[PDB]
Amino acid sequence: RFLKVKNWETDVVLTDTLHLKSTLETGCTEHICMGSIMLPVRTKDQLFPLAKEFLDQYYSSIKRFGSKAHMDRLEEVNKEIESTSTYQLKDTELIYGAKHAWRNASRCVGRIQWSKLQVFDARDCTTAHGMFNYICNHVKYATNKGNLRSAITIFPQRTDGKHDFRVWNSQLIRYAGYKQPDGSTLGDPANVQFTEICIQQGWKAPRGRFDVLPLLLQANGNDPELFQIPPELVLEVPIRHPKFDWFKDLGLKWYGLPAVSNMLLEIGGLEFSACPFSGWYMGTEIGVRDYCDNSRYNILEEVAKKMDLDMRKTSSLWKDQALVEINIAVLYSFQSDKVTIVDHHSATESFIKHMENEYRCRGGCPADWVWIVPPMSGSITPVFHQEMLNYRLTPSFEYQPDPWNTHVWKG
Amino acid sequence: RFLKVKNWETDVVLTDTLHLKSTLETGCTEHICMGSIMLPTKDQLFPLAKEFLDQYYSSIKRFGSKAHMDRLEEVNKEIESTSTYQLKDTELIYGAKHAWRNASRCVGRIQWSKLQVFDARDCTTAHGMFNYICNHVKYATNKGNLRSAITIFPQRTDGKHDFRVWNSQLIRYAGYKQPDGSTLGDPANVQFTEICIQQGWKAPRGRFDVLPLLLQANGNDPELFQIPPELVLEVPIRHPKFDWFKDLGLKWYGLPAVSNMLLEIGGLEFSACPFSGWYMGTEIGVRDYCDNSRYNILEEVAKKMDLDMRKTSSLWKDQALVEINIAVLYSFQSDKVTIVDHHSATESFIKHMENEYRCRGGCPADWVWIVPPMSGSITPVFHQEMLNYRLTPSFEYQPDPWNTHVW
Ligand code: HEM
Ligand code: HEM
Ligand SMILES: Nc1cccc(C[C@@H]2CNC[C@@H]2OCCNCCc2cccc(F)c2)n1
Ligand SMILES: Nc1cccc(C[C@@H]2CNC[C@@H]2OCCNCCc2cccc(F)c2)n1
Ligand SMILES: C[C@H](O)[C@H](O)[C@H]1CNc2nc(N)[nH]c(=O)c2N1
Ligand SMILES: C[C@H](O)[C@H](O)[C@H]1CNc2nc(N)[nH]c(=O)c2N1
Ligand SMILES: [Zn+2]
Numbered sequence: 001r002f003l004k005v006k007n008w009e010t011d012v013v014l015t016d017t018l019h020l021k022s023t024l025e026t027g028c029t030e031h032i033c034m035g036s037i038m039l040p041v042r043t044k045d046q047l048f049p050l051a052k053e054f055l056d057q058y059y060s061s062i063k064r065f066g067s068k069a070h071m072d073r074l075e076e077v078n079k080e081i082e083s084t085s086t087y088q089l090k091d092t093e094l095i096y097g098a099k100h101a102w103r104n105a106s107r108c109v110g111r112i113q114w115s116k117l118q119v120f121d122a123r124d125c126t127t128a129h130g131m132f133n134y135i136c137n138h139v140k141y142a143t144n145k146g147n148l149r150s151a152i153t154i155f156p157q158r159t160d161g162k163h164d165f166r167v168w169n170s171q172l173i174r175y176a177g178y179k180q181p182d183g184s185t186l187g188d189p190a191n192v193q194f195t196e197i198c199i200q201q202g203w204k205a206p207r208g209r210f211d212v213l214p215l216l217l218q219a220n221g222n223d224p225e226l227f228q229i230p231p232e233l234v235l236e237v238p239i240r241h242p243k244f245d246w247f248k249d250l251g252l253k254w255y256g257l258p259a260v261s262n263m264l265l266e267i268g269g270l271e272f273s274a275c276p277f278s279g280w281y282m283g284t285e286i287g288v289r290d291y292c293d294n295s296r297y298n299i300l301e302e303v304a305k306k307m308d309l310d311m312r313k314t315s316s317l318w319k320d321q322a323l324v325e326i327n328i329a330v331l332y333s334f335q336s337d338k339v340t341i342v343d344h345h346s347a348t349e350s351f352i353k354h355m356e357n358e359y360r361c362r363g364g365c366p367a368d369w370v371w372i373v374p375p376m377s378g379s380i381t382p383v384f385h386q387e388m389l390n391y392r393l394t395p396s397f398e399y400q401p402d403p404w405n406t407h408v409w410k411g
Numbered sequence: 412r413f414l415k416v417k418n419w420e421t422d423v424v425l426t427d428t429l430h431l432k433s434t435l436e437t438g439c440t441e442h443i444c445m446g447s448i449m450l451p452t453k454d455q456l457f458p459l460a461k462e463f464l465d466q467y468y469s470s471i472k473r474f475g476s477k478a479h480m481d482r483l484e485e486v487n488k489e490i491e492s493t494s495t496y497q498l499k500d501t502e503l504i505y506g507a508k509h510a511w512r513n514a515s516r517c518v519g520r521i522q523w524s525k526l527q528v529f530d531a532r533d534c535t536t537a538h539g540m541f542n543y544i545c546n547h548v549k550y551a552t553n554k555g556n557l558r559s560a561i562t563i564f565p566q567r568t569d570g571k572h573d574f575r576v577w578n579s580q581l582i583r584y585a586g587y588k589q590p591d592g593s594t595l596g597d598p599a600n601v602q603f604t605e606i607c608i609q610q611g612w613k614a615p616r617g618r619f620d621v622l623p624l625l626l627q628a629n630g631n632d633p634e635l636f637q638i639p640p641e642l643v644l645e646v647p648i649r650h651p652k653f654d655w656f657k658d659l660g661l662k663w664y665g666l667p668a669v670s671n672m673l674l675e676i677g678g679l680e681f682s683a684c685p686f687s688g689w690y691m692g693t694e695i696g697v698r699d700y701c702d703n704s705r706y707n708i709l710e711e712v713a714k715k716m717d718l719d720m721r722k723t724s725s726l727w728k729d730q731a732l733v734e735i736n737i738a739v740l741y742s743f744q745s746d747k748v749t750i751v752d753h754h755s756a757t758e759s760f761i762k763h764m765e766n767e768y769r770c771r772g773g774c775p776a777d778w779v780w781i782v783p784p785m786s787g788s789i790t791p792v793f794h795q796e797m798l799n800y801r802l803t804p805s806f807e808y809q810p811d812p813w814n815t816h817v818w
Contacts, residue, residue: 026444035446
């Protein structure tokens, strides 16, 4: 079967055949669409078929499908599964797998970059201290003094689900949040609960608006342990505005390295529950979401106050006005300090070209419109007008529940 | 079976059961989501009629009453004999209000029960259609104090005798291709603007020429009529701070009135059913003015603002977009023509959702259309999970008639 997507701005029509390779379920049915729902121990039995699909994909990509080397590898993996109930990926397979999870990530606007990914193999890691060292190195390599490079660090896979490696932080670098007795929050409201766990674990909190959280790291299913990232490894940008000189006195800064640490990487049936990865920011993630969400730093009022905007009626678009200025400041600040950042115009335009290329060479590009369209100025970006098909390919990145909800405390 | 929706800003969780009454198909499967795709007999008619009359009699609290049973028999007898049936006035009013209530792409449904219904089922000619339409336009406009309305022409029969309004909206501006290579006026309507000239319209060939109506009665060839200019309320666009803005020569019409959809009530198909409410500001200022394939005015506005258009990262498009939208709202407000901003509209829709969850057990909603085309995440709808499903009565898209009609 063949499915068409249309771009309503250009009349370009594309044909999807790749969706035929899709296995996992979407959440949707013929009766209900769940496209805006945020979240819609394997046996030998189910594992070998998952391994086989994967290795067939891998061997096709290197143009060796059906080769003696392909067949020997199937036999070898088969025999490893029947003997040990699991198997180990070769380095080449791990790299290919991790690149493809990113390529298959339908919510990611940054995928033009998928084939340039530094893979760090951390499968020999055994302790929390080991994990801290690997992560420090990842941070330093990725930051590259402002000239950001994409990377992922892959810790040992799940075995019986009782010995999982996990990073408890949702991102490697994030700011503390402190709920006050009067109901107000200091710092990032998104991180209150995690900040609380850190404090209970023995973190001494500075209690300011921008305290970089400590890493909380779990190796081999053990209770997690705290570590401070060396501050000299944590690149930060003070936010100022090209024309507004009072902007600096708001006291805003942000970190340069966005690095997701709470997802699960699946490759050929194997589950890597600790696989932190990082790229670089699109400006709107900080300027729109982190600064302007009501449940985040929520700076719209204060910025609009200082701007002397008419704040008495929403119909003045004071919020919209202040939002643009904040986002201008973020892009200007990163650019001035030579820290890699991309604006939402350039990022969406590059995504469109990537997507078209993927249709020509791969037969499709799964994409989640709800996420791909930026959270400001939607329809003046070309993605707004782009019909997209969303479906699940493996290898993949998956959401996993926060570990403090599941962990068996050992004491 | 019982599904939950979460708002990620407020933590409010709502439970949906209304979807279990869902009937039509979405386009999506377990393998593929099509959420962002724009277009994804006697035996057949009676279940549809029964389903409808059951919900109608349930709504007036007479489910399983004698009047209920009597009406089901009457409609069944009429189908068996005539191969169709006619709605009581009460059933028409209810059906049309509920089609709006079930419209998952409509942010404005808080208003659903205040809908003036104009029964035009006795219409027989294009001239008749024109008279009903002018009356609709004048009633709804109300000198700027807009009132929601729909006018409903006769239902489909053998399908060779359809009533259709060929315009996509009652009021829209002409579009003309030029030797120059570019486009004058609204590029969205070029094709239609040509069909009108092909039918004998003398086009003024300006930037903002109100199009003629092109009305099809009883499956006949369609005819042209100019809406009396004094009935088309228009708004000149100025900025509260930028003096120069007015010199761009921009204006828009006050009445949005969708005329190309198909209203389905209890299995019956009303193919000409123009309806109207009032504008959310972004439709005009973001989409009509700034879409690249529309009036596409960002380039010119940014130039007057003397912004740095050298690089995309100066956010010059974004700055201009905001001012253009401030102007649209200000102009409408100054001339006392109803308009709603996207903040107030989306806030209203959240309240409507909560009302519908407690009262009805849910609210079908299409997040891709509900979230405004600017400033998405600073409106509350961005953070609201929504479930999308199809209920009847409903409004459905139908293809442009010129593709289908034979002359
Ligand atoms: C290289 C520059 C990149 C840019 C500009 C970029 C852009 C983005 C953005 C804006 C989002 C949505 C962010 C949000 O709203 O939370 C996203 C999501 C995502 N991206 Fe990227 N990305 C980049 C690199 C990467 C890399 C290196 C990976 C993994 C190897 C990745 C995988 C993902 C995944 C799995 C999601 C979904 C996250 C979730 O479900 O929470 N991206 N991308
Ligand atoms: C009272 C003021 C109203 C407001 C502010 C409003 C708002 C909107 C908006 C912003 C859209 C998206 C339109 C677009 O972007 O093209 C929409 C779509 C729609 N609305 Fe409303 N609405 C109003 C009244 C009505 C009425 C009176 C009806 C029917 C009786 C209606 C039924 C619909 C339908 C069927 C759609 C989807 C149209 C399509 O698929 O093209 N709305 N509404
Ligand atoms: N899948 C889910 C489910 C629930 C929650 C979440 C994280 C939310 C999504 N939105 C806010 C927060 O996620 C914030 C982190 N997102 C950064 C993604 C990114 C950008 C650039 C480079 C790179 F490597 C990675 N995900
Ligand atoms: N369902 C479809 C499919 C294809 C095309 C379309 C019309 C397009 C969609 N997007 C722009 C244009 O629709 C025209 C604008 N629609 C106005 C909706 C509205 C607002 C306020 C009051 C009221 F009565 C009606 N619909
Ligand atoms: C409910 C809704 O799905 C949710 O707010 C989504 C919408 N789109 C998003 N898009 C991105 N990129 N990131 C997000 O966190 C969200 N949140
Ligand atoms: C491809 C995508 O579905 C298309 O651009 C949609 C997106 N959301 C929309 N939302 C509204 N309200 N109106 C539209 O015309 C569109 N267009
Ligand atoms: Zn879907």
